């Protein structure tokens, strides 16, 4: 009893989080599987702080004040279970284990129930913001057993990033896997915004012939409009950046995007629960497409594009159209993200506070922007809002962007520029707007070849099977 | 010993399959959990055939010639395992159980290994063609333990549909879950083609103002071009069809498409193995979108579409553009389908014969068309073909359809018609064609906020991390 909390996992993220907590007046006791690293940290980065070091799990648990609070920041999967295995013999009923890794929400559900049975309070929190964010103010998204929450509130909300009006980008998300589910959706959305920016980038580069100086300028300009966001800002910096030889660095790097799993999982969840989260899906498949680098080099030699028609129009107006096409598409991505969140909530019985979630994403995290503020007061004005597009601000924003959005897509399609996310976002927008869709033909076909039955428009609920085949043979 | 094979599951599909086998000179012994149904079948549909009936599993197994062959055509999941449980006590080493339901390929892998351990030969086959197809000639796609295969060859290939040059639409697909995996991809592709037809339908209806008489005419015309397929054919019939009051039936049915799982699973598999099967993904999400019927009625009242600009052009030329846009898009869907198949083969060590698979889909199944014939000789000319688009016929077909495809998409985008699959197919086509994509910006961003490292274009394999943040602070 002296340390308020322990953290296991002394990679840079773990180190920065302990330092942040120490700076906020909390005595942290550090531990790591390779025990050497605890000494190293105390002699170096934590020299002259209040952090304690442990050299065995038993010593770490003796150091903790009761209810003992311990954070796991190890590689998601097996290791989290192994540490739980060790820790549970050593803990009293009412102690708290927190998993901060990017765990599978179903594993977190599992572990939360299991430990609840043994009287140990389990919380899974998403942590967002990279290593420097961890150092000064991460978004923390905790969920699991709420009895833990009053005992960690102070620590979590104290080290969390704070929005201009003082609030922490951290609050209790919900039961069992809710914090981790919100975390993976966060990353799904991140993928979506990155791909949208890549498509804007591709239109300016290849339709408008803009060099990276002018392109970085255009992005800094955009970072002063509604598109004000961390990602637009760093993109301007990346486009400017010069390598050791004075030439721009971005054109020299390989176009094969990596993935670590969370994006993929958002798409898979949308498919499992039947939610049309089409833009994150396209973003994930666009990373898959770029991985096929060698295949694409072969294809460029064989497959022909459209007739090369030079852009004949005003560069400034078109650059504005790209601005609006990105903004409208981003609106659709976020509407789809909150549709998934909403569906997961009825699927697992979570009572999510959507305005709360938007606030947790307003600062600290990679998707932070002024835009999340507008989403938050959409849900403040109406917390039962079914879809973001029905909110007057978003509805007016899309209406305003509309023919620039259509103009940018048509020009891209004429010029042969791949726009998977710009086009999904418009297709979804036009799908969702239509009270009557051609899906009635799907239903008629399925009834025709596999008797699956259909409903009439007037009289929903009664299912009919027409004998199409021969209606008079 | 008298029955050559048994079939358990006397729903219409099961009944029709037994009758088909009987017509081909095989003594089938029928069984069903609700034993009454066996009597009913013998007194009615099977009256005066050579089929035997059993009233207990033990009696059914006594009736079978050795190696005893039994087909399960029950609801996928639990029931298949339960029947296996019962059957295994009763069987000799070297007997064969065949699961013909639309099972999860991983369950089939599991069961195949397990029964192999007990010396029982297990095969999972996809069966396709609906009840009438089952009656006269289904596509059968068997996979699992190949020792079974010589003992079922005759039955399976004899009752299978046959392509004009005499071959059966049935051959051994591969090890463990291969037959069932091919089956789910078949259904994924089916979803894709149905949605493409719905989008063509939607453009003629709303851009061209065509009535269903003219639309059915246009589809019959198309069924005489490269688009000759079972689905185009039945669509012409559906559009013509008149209800009891003389009015067309299709406009009266509810636009909320159902789903039974296999499409969803093709998309989920593509995501798990990192294959950009974007059009089946969009087709699945488009069914999800139509399910939100009430939400769309609300949205149509609030969200505004583009400025209504009447189609000013030649109806006949535009109808031709829609033809070509559908055909090019279908080519991309199938290229993506065989990319998944190819990746699954390296993932599970299956040696698939792609030309063989195309032949199994050429007749019997719902996706049957002349088009599958062209795919088959693409792989006959070159069985190591990496992607269908690299084959000269397909490459020339896409090149030919190209500006009609672009024209149809631009007009749809201007008019506000939802085209999720037409637009994915073009976005993918333009993505795959480009030797250099903007994914290098993704890589630069990921290295910037989460140090994930990148490769340079010259020198693949060496990973670098630039310190972007302050390059001179």
From Swiss-Prot, chains A, B:
Binding partners and assembly: Homodimer.
Gene designation: PGD
Molecular-function annotations in GO: NADP binding; phosphogluconate dehydrogenase (decarboxylating) activity
Enzyme class: oxidoreductase
Protein name: 6-phosphogluconate dehydrogenase, decarboxylating
Active-site positions on this chain: 183 (proton acceptor), 190 (proton donor)
Compartments where located: Cytoplasm
Biological process annotations from GO: D-gluconate metabolic process; pentose-phosphate shunt
Binding-site residues, substrate: 102, 128, 130, 186-187, 191, 260, 287, 446, 452
Taxonomic classification: Eukaryota, Metazoa, Chordata, Craniata, Vertebrata
Modified residues (N6-acetyllysine): 37
Family annotation (PANTHER family): 6-PHOSPHOGLUCONATE DEHYDROGENASE (PTHR11811)
Naturally occurring in which organism (per UniProt): Ovis aries
Catalyzed reactions per annotation: 6-phospho-D-gluconate + NADP(+) = D-ribulose 5-phosphate + CO2 + NADPH
Keyword presence, Cytoplasm: yes
């Amino acid at each position: 009893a002296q340390a308020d909390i322990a953290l296991i996992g002394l990679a840079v993220m773990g180190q920065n989080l302990i330092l942040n907590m120490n700076d906020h007046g909390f005595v942290v006791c550090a531990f790591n599987r390779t025990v050497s690293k605890v000494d190293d940290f105390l002699a170096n980065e934590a020299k002259g702080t209040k952090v304690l070091g442990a050299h065995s799990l038993e010593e770490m648990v003796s150091k903790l004040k009761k209810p003992r609070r311990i954070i796991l920041l190890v590689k998601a999967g097996q290791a989290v279970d192994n540490f739980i295995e060790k820790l549970v013999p050593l803990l009293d009923i009412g102690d708290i284990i927190i998993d901060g890794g990017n765990s599978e929400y179903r594993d977190t559900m599992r572990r939360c129930r299991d430990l609840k049975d043994k009287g140990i309070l389990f919380v899974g929190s998403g942590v967002s913001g990279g290593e420097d964010g961890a150092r000064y103010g991460p978004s923390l998204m905790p969920g699991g057993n709420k009895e833990a929450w009053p005992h960690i509130k102070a620590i979590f909300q104290g080290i969390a990033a704070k929005v201009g009006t003082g609030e922490p980008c951290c609050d209790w998300v919900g039961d069992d896997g809710a914090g981790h589910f919100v975390k993976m959706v966060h990353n799904g959305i991140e993928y979506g915004d990155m791909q949208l920016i890549c498509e804007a980038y591709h239109l300016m580069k290849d339709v408008l012939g803009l060099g990276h100086k002018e392109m970085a300028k255009a992005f800094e300009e955009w970072n002063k409009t509604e598109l004000d966001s961390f990602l637009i800002e760093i993109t301007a910096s990346i486009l400017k950046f010069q390598d050791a030889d004075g030439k721009h660095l971005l054109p020299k790097i390989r176009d094969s995007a990596g993935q670590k799993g969370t994006g993929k999982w958002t798409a898979i969840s949308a498919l499992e629960y039947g939610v049309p989260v089409t833009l994150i899906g396209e973003a994930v498949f666009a990373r898959c497409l770029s991985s096929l680098k060698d295949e694409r080099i072969q294809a460029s030699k064989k497959l022909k594009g459209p007739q090369n028609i030079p852009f004949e129009g005003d560069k400034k107006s078109f650059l504005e159209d790209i601005r609006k096409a990105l903004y409208a598409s981003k609106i659709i991505s976020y509407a789809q993200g909150f549709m998934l969140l909403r569906q997961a909530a009825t699927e697992f019985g979570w009572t999510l506070n959507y305005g709360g979630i938007a606030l947790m994403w307003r600062g600290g995290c990679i998707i932070r922007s002024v835009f999340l503020g507008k989403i938050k007061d959409a849900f403040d004005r109406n917390p039962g809002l079914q879809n973001l597009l029905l909110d007057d601000f978003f509805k007016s924003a899309v209406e305003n962007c509309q023919d620039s959005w259509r103009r940018a897509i048509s020009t891209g399609v004429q010029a042969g520029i791949p726009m998977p996310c710009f086009t999904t976002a418009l297709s979804f927008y036009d799908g969702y707007r239509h009270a009557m869709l051609p899906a009635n033909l799907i239903q008629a076909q399925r009834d025709y070849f596999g008797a699956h039955t259909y409903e009439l428009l007037a009289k929903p609920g009664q299912f009919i099977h027409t004998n199409w085949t021969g209606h008079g043979g």
